Amino acid sequence: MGASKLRAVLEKLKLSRDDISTAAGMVKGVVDHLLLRLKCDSAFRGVGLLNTGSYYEHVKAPNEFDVMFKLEVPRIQLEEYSNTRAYYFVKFKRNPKENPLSQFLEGEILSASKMLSKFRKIIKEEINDIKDTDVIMKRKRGGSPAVTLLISEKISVDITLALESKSSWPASTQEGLRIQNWLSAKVRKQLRLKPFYLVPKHAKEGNGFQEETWRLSFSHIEKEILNNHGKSKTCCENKEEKCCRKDCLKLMKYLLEQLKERFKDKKHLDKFSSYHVKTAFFHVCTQNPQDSQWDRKDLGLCFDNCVTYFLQCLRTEKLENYFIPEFNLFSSNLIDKRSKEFLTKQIEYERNNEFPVFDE
Numbered sequence: 001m002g003a004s005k006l007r008a009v010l011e012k013l014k015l016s017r018d019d020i021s022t023a024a025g026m027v028k029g030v031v032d033h034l035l036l037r038l039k040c041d042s043a044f045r046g047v048g049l050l051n052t053g054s055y056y057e058h059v060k061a062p063n064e065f066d067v068m069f070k071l072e073v074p075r076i077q078l079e080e081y082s083n084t085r086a087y088y089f090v091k092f093k094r095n096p097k098e099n100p101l102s103q104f105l106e107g108e109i110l111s112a113s114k115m116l117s118k119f120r121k122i123i124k125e126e127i128n129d130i131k132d133t134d135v136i137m138k139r140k141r142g143g144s145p146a147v148t149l150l151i152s153e154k155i156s157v158d159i160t161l162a163l164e165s166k167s168s169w170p171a172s173t174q175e176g177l178r179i180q181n182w183l184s185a186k187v188r189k190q191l192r193l194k195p196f197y198l199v200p201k202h203a204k205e206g207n208g209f210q211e212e213t214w215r216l217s218f219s220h221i222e223k224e225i226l227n228n229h230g231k232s233k234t235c236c237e238n239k240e241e242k243c244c245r246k247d248c249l250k251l252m253k254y255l256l257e258q259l260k261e262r263f264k265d266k267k268h269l270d271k272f273s274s275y276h277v278k279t280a281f282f283h284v285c286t287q288n289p290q291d292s293q294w295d296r297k298d299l300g301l302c303f304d305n306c307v308t309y310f311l312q313c314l315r316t317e318k319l320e321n322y323f324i325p326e327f328n329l330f331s332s333n334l335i336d337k338r339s340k341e342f343l344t345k346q347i348e349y350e351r352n353n354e355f356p357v358f359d360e
């Protein structure tokens, strides 16, 4: 695929500032309401919106949003669950006083499900009485840490509770975030000085879930490297330094979206998500650390790079969490071989036919 061809695909996907800002305005209204309602509970007194510029997650298009509600909690003490590397039990270093989160304490262990339940119940209670905006809560999605809302039958919002820890990141992330040769060792240090988050997504335990466990999240870091993405500090600030990194990611996401859409009737692509694509993309960024390897005229080659890497990940059934290297997002235990073989074949068909998926 030629570079100009690929950018013509993105150009026709570009949304009008009006349709975007209207969409953003609706979710902000709902979010503002939920935040203040939430503050009426002592346990969520500390809730606040984490890292949101309210830019949508779908390319097409401005109908889906992903928000995290960060909760500042006292010094946290983690205990890794069954060496899963990403899931943890949360305990408090000092709990002699009857904590505000004490109601969610099952033993010395802060229950993810109990918090998630109340969080959800509080939100569901304010959804009936929202002024001027029609809002509905979606069914619980299997295994999701998120409360999903649908605004005006058009806009989906994922609202995810997020415990904030200012402690240093857990050992499982020691070899993660390999950005040294790309964004530099000192950027990695400064990033790792920032807080990490815990969302109420439970580890698998037999036919069910270990309902107390939380999972690590670094969406704030993911946000930072996407918007400050070059080896050069002035990457994408002038004509002579315009790179195609953001375009590649968009095209990879739109490819996955379109395929998921085409084959909704089948079940094969249901477990794949833009998070897989974003992760695959970060790895490619690490493999191609130079801004010259992401030249604007090379969008064609760079996109194929991303496609090819993603394909290798599907075939070998290995896609490392960018922050937690021993967590395999593509293990056969999460996504079975057939689904990955199906996605593999469709992407390959697309590439061999000049991406019919990319035209209207």
Ligand SMILES: Nc1nc(=O)c2ncn([C@@H]3O[C@@H]4COP(=O)(O)O[C@H]5[C@@H](O)[C@H](n6cnc7c(N)ncnc76)O[C@@H]5COP(=O)(O)O[C@@H]3[C@@H]4O)c2[nH]1
Binding pocket: 066, 141, 142, 143, 144, 145, 146, 158, 159, 160, 199, 201, 216, 217, 218, 219, 270, 271, 272, 273, 274, 275, 276, 329
């Ligand atoms: N809004 C939202 N924020 C999250 O952090 C998150 N984590 C999971 N989910 C959704 O819960 C359900 C259970 O999926 P699972 O955990 O088994 O696999 C997930 C998970 O391993 C990984 N993943 C997705 N988002 C994140 C994330 N923010 N951080 C780490 N991993 C993530 O990508 C897989 C599929 O993602 P989605 O299919 O788009 O949404 C999942 C899914 O609907 C999330 N939904």
Ligand SMILES: [Zn+2]
Binding pocket: 229, 230, 235, 236, 241, 242, 243, 244, 245
């Ligand atoms: Zn750039």
